[PDB]
């Protein structure tokens, strides 16, 4: 069955960016979806996105643009320590001057740099660049 809505959502985002489109439909739009895209839109990778509220689970329609290169999920969500942030960012980022590693901490969802600015750690959700 479906195990990660984030994997299905982000795969739909990539496959639309691979084919050149400006929009994609996201089902079923969990909380960690918006938090993941809310981080993404603050960095300008996606921009406007819309929540269609069906009474079942929700839907998301996203307006895309050619800025994004790849946005995926690392499963399972490993526990990453404040010293292990470096290893993740070197393995799964194209360079160390751009790109963000999205990882959930006790203080909400944030990138690998906002974690360093706040000096907090937690579990890893994914990556966008």
């Amino acid at each position: 069955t479906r195990s990660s809505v984030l994997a299905d959502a982000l795969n739909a985002i990539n496959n639309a960016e691979k084919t050149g489109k400006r929009q994609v439909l996201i089902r079923p739009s969990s909380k960690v979806i918006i938090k993941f895209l809310q981080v993404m839109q603050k960095h300008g990778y996606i921009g406007e996105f819309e929540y269609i509220d069906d009474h079942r689970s929700g839907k998301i329609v996203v307006q895309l643009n050619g800025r994004l290169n790849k946005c995926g999920v690392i499963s399972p969500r490993f526990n990453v320590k404040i010293g292990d942030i470096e290893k993740w960012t070197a393995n799964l980022l194209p360079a160390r001057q751009f790109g963000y590693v999205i990882l959930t901490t006790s203080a909400g969802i944030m990138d690998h740099e906002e974690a360093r600015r706040k000096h907090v750690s937690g579990k890893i959700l994914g990556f966008v660049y």
């Binding site: 489109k21 400006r22 929009q23 819309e50 269609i52």
Partner: protein
């Protein structure tokens, strides 16, 4: 393609889509208001009634179950509700 308005699609396409795969799913079916011949005894019935519905006054027939919509009686009158 590659630029489409998924927010507000045309209703003609929404009429074509299956009742599950549309923007927000909903029942294509409806409820009837069928006038029984003779006594008024106005009653309401499902479109896919799936049972041989009949009124209490003259319990002969109003409709017959079928694999699709319910076929109404030969002589009767109905008003869409």
């Amino acid at each position: 393609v590659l630029v489409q308005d998924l927010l507000h699609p045309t209703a003609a396409s929404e009429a074509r889509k299956h009742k599950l795969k549309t923007l927000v799913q909903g029942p294509r079916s409806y409820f009837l208001d069928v006038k029984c011949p003779g006594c008024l005894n106005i009653t309401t019935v499902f479109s896919h009634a799936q049972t041989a519905v009949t009124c209490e006054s003259c319990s002969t027939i109003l409709c017959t179950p079928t694999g699709g919509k319910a076929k109404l009686s030969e002589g009767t009158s109905f008003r869409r509700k």
